[PDB]
Subunit: 289 residues, 3 copies
């Protein structure tokens, strides 16, 4: 049968980005809905689980997206709640590319570290957005001592508490109100991620290149001024003295491949659940070829 | 040329269920619209009748759906009104699966009866919803003497009048306010259908298995408690004494195949009109 | 890579007509958005320019449509503004089919004239709609002395001013309130176009057939009464006493081929820009 992807977007209209990548992942047809909520998604899921039987079920799948991760998660939980017994299809959550971006970034850094970050300090500057929170979660699952930073302690602690509950980890929070406190926060860190909003610098070249402990720096911001000073957005494990850098476009190349590969996996079984953990497991395989 | 289905849904967004079945019926592409009304549908229909010529016209078709049958019918009449002369495409109406469900149910019962129900009493309990009304219409078109039941006579009579006007049949109405009256209403019936809302029992086992006249019972409710007591939802002509039973899942298997087959017919000509009568004609071929 | 067309419609929902012709033009998939504005289109364009690299970029393209040409143009300018450096895809603007209609009509009249209309008087009756304004734009670009007519001078002058600014030409306006003034307005004209609204006559047979200066007449109205009296909608350069005529269906045959060719070309490079000028350049090649 034809591979049908149902795209459920929490925004007013479905993401164009998610359509292109869905087709490049091998969907035969993508049918998109905007304004999806936990209340209206149940009837859409019924359409996917009562129309095809046996092996044909794996040819229908669900992708949840949109700009807001918390809204995407509520819809994704309502999808999983509507399934029962054998009445289910594979599903994926990737609101604004946040899961695939964080999975790509953490997989590349863990590989560059020699395959382990256990017991080492990892700092996620501006870690209160969805990319920073998913990065913190994946690093903490790998055993890193994670400090999730932001301009206000209350917001940073609420982000750490949310990650800790969802992923069963113990990330800690720190307030970094200014440039100087972000330079102080990376002292003694082995791994540094900048997960800031687009077009902002969070850490100059002098604040990381003179810190002996820093092994690898990773930046998710591709718009100049880049999150980390002294690197290029295309860096992908480029050496700077004894340290290695990953720029946003170096990470982005793997994120695009991973997102397409997750879509293809949705049609290989009718019971896949692709959220951060499963997406990250695939990212690590794809970083080792 | 590619088989293009245009899906016109009266609800805020198009039915996912209708998309999957449309693709499995052989549409190459489905383009769906929500909030479709008799007023905005005309311009959509123009796009289907002025873009392709000759043999290619049959490669575009229209499917009308949504949760409200009366709203679907108004859009479907506006679609038919927009065509003129040879400027037309095939169209189907199946709001909430009501046509394909009723067509499958009645086709299976008529086949199990030996191919005729003419002159025999058929009772449709909770027959005032779209499935019950379309079932009453198809049974009456087969010559059965149909009694359409509901909790209030005014609503049951309005449903019978609507069916009678649309289909040129003579269905009668009856008030059955509770279990006792439903049990009384089936006495002397040869065929009994339960078309109740989801998850409700309407006819316990003792209300039909001891009625000598009853030949076949059919239930459209798949959610326990089932409309008919003493049967399984998967029953598909299963024998109980000298009687037969069709559960909702036994009927639903044919409805899904029937719906897919109707979609494929839309692309075989530019003049098909798939409403209850034509869907039912195909359901009978598919049961034989 | 699959050829993905992103349809951005300024109306509440995307045009059905544009979907059918996009598919027949060779798009593998069409994904449509309604309510597109200069403000929300930027994020949609980002989805087209950051998802594919190298030779795959040209397999995604953009089509802008809707019933209002000015609204379409604002969306189309915002699409072009979002591109930067090599981060771009091919795009087309054809709100309500007006660019592909005007380009087909003007191309045929210019070819039939021997390849030039420079310095000759061209009159566009009811030229204030998008087809008339685009015809006046393309004719003025060909060096014709263009008079754009309408029932009220203010509306005709506003249309002329808009064309002049956008295309850098010098179209003049004239008020022709009725049949008598329209018959007076064509005196001395070598080329006449009727770009009136559907189902209206603007130029009776006696108002053009006895004027010696007139060489070719062209009508965009396909619905009787036709814009030009004494012709058939299928006429395509047909001779009427030393003069040639083009009816709306004769022009339309070129138009349907031109629109398909524009869709196919969107996937041949990532830098095509299909507005009036480029559509007209292609229409001129296809008429040969
Ligand atoms: C605005 C877009 N909207 C989205 N929307 C959703 N739903 N999901 C997303 O992932 C994104 N984005 C993803 N984005 C995005 C993703 C990848 C690249 C390009 C890549 O980062 C690489 O540059 C290339 O694939 C080539 O690879 C090369 O470039 C460098 C090195 C090398 O590997 C650009 C933008 C945008 C930030 C952003
Ligand atoms: C929630 C859904 N929404 C819709 N929406 C619309 N637009 N149209 C519809 O027909 C439906 N439905 C169709 N529905 C629906 C249709 C078929 C089956 C399953 C079938 O009844 C059969 O069970 C199987 O095809 C396999 O066949 C076997 O399984 C058992 C028996 C046997 O026949 C279940 C639910 C739902 C009641 C309901
Ligand atoms: N390539 C891709 O596919 C892709 C996909 C998704 C995201 N991205 C990129 O990844 C990065 C992170 O994405 P996101 O969605 O998680 O980011 P985000 O939510 O927009 O912002 C992350 C955090 O940045 C901090 N911030 C905002 N303005 C600031 C300022 N003026 N100074 C200091 N800090 C500031 C905020 O933290 P506090 O308020 O707590 O300080 C905010 O929570 C972005 O640059 C984005 O473009 C790329
Ligand atoms: N397999 C499929 O694909 C498919 C497709 C469509 C429908 N169905 C099923 O078919 C059945 C009929 O559908 P429908 O849409 O026609 O049903 P409906 O409109 O929801 O309900 C039918 C009638 O049931 C009666 N009713 C409601 N609540 C009741 C109560 N508490 N006690 C007694 N009667 C009650 C009402 O009649 P009165 O008020 O007149 O008494 C009502 O008009 C449903 O069970 C539905 O799930 C299946
Ligand atoms: N085959 C195709 O793909 C296709 C595509 C697009 C257009 N067309 C055809 O091309 C023609 C022109 O299209 P359009 O969108 O540019 O036209 P339009 O905007 O609907 O009308 C053009 C002009 O006609 C004049 N008009 C309207 N009612 C009139 C009346 N009662 N008497 C005299 N003049 C009147 C108006 O000018 P004033 O108010 O200034 O007098 C109006 O601005 C139409 O016939 C249309 O059907 C064909």
């Amino acid at each position: 049968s034809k591979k049908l992807l149902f795209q459920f977007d929490t925004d007013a209209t479905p993401s164009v980005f998610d359509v292109v990548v869905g087709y490049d992942g091998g969907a035969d047809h993508i049918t998109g809905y905007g304004n999806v909520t936990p209340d209206n998604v149940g009837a859409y899921v019924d359409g996917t689980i009562y129309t095809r039987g046996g092996k044909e079920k794996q040819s229908t799948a669900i992708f949840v997206g949109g700009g807001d991760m918390a809204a995407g998660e509520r819809v994704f939980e309502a999808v999983k709640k509507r399934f029962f017994g054998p009445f289910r299809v594979s599903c994926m959550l990737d609101s604004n590319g946040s899961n695939t971006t964080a999975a790509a970034g953490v997989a590349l850094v863990v590989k560059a570290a020699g395959g382990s970050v256990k017991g080492k300090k990892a700092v996620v500057l501006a870690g209160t957005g969805p990319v920073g929170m998913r990065s913190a979660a994946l690093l903490a699952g790998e055993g890193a001592e994670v400090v999730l930073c932001g301009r206000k302690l209350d917001k940073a602690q609420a982000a750490a508490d949310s990650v800790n509950k969802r992923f069963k980890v113990n990330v800690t929070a720190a307030e970094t109100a200014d440039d100087a406190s972000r330079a102080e926060a990376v002292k003694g860190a082995h791994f540094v991620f900048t997960a800031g909003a687009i077009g902002l610098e969070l850490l100059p070249q002098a604040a990381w290149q003179n810190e002996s402990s820093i092994e690898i720096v990773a930046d998710y911001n591709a718009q100049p001024p880049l999150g980390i000073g002294g690197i290029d957005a295309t860096d992908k494990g480029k050496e700077y003295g004894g340290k290695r850098a990953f720029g946003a476009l170096g990470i982005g190349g793997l994120k695009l491949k991973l997102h397409r590969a997750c879509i293809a996996k949705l049609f290989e079984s009718s019971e896949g659940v692709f959220d951060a953990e499963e997406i990250y497991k695939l990212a690590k395989e794809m970083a080792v070829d």
